[PDB]
Amino acid sequence: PQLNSGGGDELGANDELIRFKDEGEQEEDLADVKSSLVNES
Amino acid sequence: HAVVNLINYQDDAELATRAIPELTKLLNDEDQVVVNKAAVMVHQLSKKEASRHAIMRSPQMVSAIVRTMQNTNDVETARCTAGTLHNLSHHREGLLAIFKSGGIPALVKMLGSPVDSVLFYAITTLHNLLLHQEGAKMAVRLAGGLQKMVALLNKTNVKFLAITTDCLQILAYGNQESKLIILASGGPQALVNIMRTYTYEKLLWTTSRVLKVLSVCSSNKPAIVEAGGMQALGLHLTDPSQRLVQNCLWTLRNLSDAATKQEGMEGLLGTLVQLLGSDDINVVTCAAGILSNLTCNNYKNKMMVCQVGGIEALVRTVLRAGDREDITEPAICALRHLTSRHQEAEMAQNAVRLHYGLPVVVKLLHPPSHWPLIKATVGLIRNLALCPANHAPLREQGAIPRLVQLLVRAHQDTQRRFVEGVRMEEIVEGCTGALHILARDVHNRIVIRGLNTIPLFVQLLYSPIENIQRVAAGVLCELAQDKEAAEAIEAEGATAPLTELLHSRNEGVATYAAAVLFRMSE
């Protein structure tokens, strides 16, 4: 069987990707942006 | 205050009993000119805060306003009615009234209007609802607001775009289905365009938040990359706004593992190397992470990072990072990538030593380091060992006995009838591979054999995993050129497995096996 990850040879260790997938935090100041937008029509 | 309270109380009664019920009837008129004129009056009334309650507390009125807006063919009428609903959307009561009156589907329909005044009233009102009305998000999605919103990203008013993008962020967060709809509507390209087009910070910020949410989606991620997302987000890494810089970094990191084939990454890479020296821990952490993924199997990126002094920058990051593994793991993985398979790989292997990084690097193999960092560090040491100049210093830092310890423990833990996200089989291959390279040196060979490793290395020849068989045969190949070692290997009964390995499809395994066999016979 072959190694699922990692490994390497005479040229060194095999490069590997770090799976980043952080969505984290939905802040559940556009107030002025909103009023400003509507205060012209 | 008593005067206004009395006057308002009286006016509220006159409105709730005469004005409102009358205007509701007129809004329902067959004559469109009457409806239009009535819509104006209702709008004028909505401008006065004290008059709003009379308007919102009448379901018949609200429903007539919504129905009129959604069905009218008069621009001015659509404007007045949308403006009215906006005026009623500042508090819980009004929002609930608009919601129960079926205002959401009507407000969404208005997003298809070519008139700015209508669009502006529509998006800000939907935003208020999205922020405070429970059930608003699902209604907007069901009404197809996502598609309409994405289509509006080609508009030019930056304030309008800021609100529109924020609605997308609110609707998309933690909702995989909403992200796919956005993707299907061409959201990625439209969002990336904004990032490389406008300078309005609030818009870049809200837009970067939508991209972050979409960056964890396996479908949106490659779409963002292909749209030039990486280069675009990189444009703002030095912007005065910290919230923007950090959102761009988090997004870049999420996307990084799917951007290893992108061109035009010079500027981005150069900026990330600089950020490695930031006092901000979250910035250094993201810079290290993104660089690790970008240098992965891309010689061009490796070359550029080295050319901008990435080796020195990464060693410095590791030196001041101490036990923070969030920083050291990616930084070490980056150094690992940079020390192999490229024109400047050899130069990078020496540079780590020349920048006083060997001691701290070997130190990371020891507690309290966790398996992810150890695995990465073993990989880096393995590459550093390719450089003859690193043979002695690595031994002097105690790398050999620590690698042997990790190997023994990892191997014994594989005995049976994932640890901290790492398979012990990976550590066995890694440590043995590192030892195989370090064994090219004669003094190291003595140290290695003195730790009574031969019995283990021979045992490894029986491993099902051929990658492990390869490194075991290889280290034995190096050690075997020593008489006592060759005889010890023979005594361990290595002749049988090695003979079997001679047939291995793996040329490396076969060659090493034969080498060891020849050494023993001699």
UniProtKB/Swiss-Prot annotation, chain A:
Participates in the Wnt signaling pathway. Binds to DNA and acts as a repressor in the absence of ctnnb1-A and possibly ctnnb1-B, and as an activator in the presence of these proteins. Required early in development for the establishment of the dorsal body axis in response to maternal Wnt signaling. Also required during development of the CNS for the establishment of dorsal-ventral patterning in the prospective diencephalon. Belongs to the TCF/LEF family. The gene is tcf7l1-a. Transmembrane segments: none annotated. This is Transcription factor 7-like 1-A. It is found in: Cytoplasm; Nucleus. Phosphorylated. Phosphorylation by csnk1e promotes binding to ctnnb1-A while phosphorylation by gsk3b may reverse this effect. It comes from Xenopus laevis. Residues 16-28 have a biased composition (Basic and acidic residues).
Curated annotation (Swiss-Prot), chain B:
Changing residue 45 to A: No effect on interaction with BCL9 and CDH3. Its main location: cytoplasm. The modification Phosphoserine is found at residues 58, 113. One of its GO terms (cellular component) is microvillus membrane. Changing residue 179 to E: Abolishes TCF7L2 binding. Changing residue 159 to N: Found in a patient with features of osteopathia striata cranial sclerosis; uncertain significance; results in increased Wnt signaling. The keyword Protease does not apply. Keywords: Acetylation, Activator, Cell adhesion, Cell junction, Cell membrane, Cell projection, Chromosomal rearrangement, Cytoplasm, Cytoskeleton, Disease variant, Glycoprotein, Host-virus interaction, Intellectual disability, Membrane, Neurogenesis, Nucleus, Phosphoprotein, Repeat, S-nitrosylation, Synapse, Transcription, Transcription regulation, Ubl conjugation, Wnt signaling pathway. Key downstream component of the canonical Wnt signaling pathway. In the absence of Wnt, forms a complex with AXIN1, AXIN2, APC, CSNK1A1 and GSK3B that promotes phosphorylation on N-terminal Ser and Thr residues and ubiquitination of CTNNB1 via BTRC and its subsequent degradation by the proteasome. In the presence of Wnt ligand, CTNNB1 is not ubiquitinated and accumulates in the nucleus, where it acts as a coactivator for transcription factors of the TCF/LEF family, leading to activate Wnt responsive genes. Also acts as a coactivator for other transcription factors, such as NR5A2. Belongs to the beta-catenin family. This is Catenin beta-1. It comes from Homo sapiens (Human). The lineage of its organism: Eukaryota, Metazoa, Chordata, Craniata, Vertebrata.
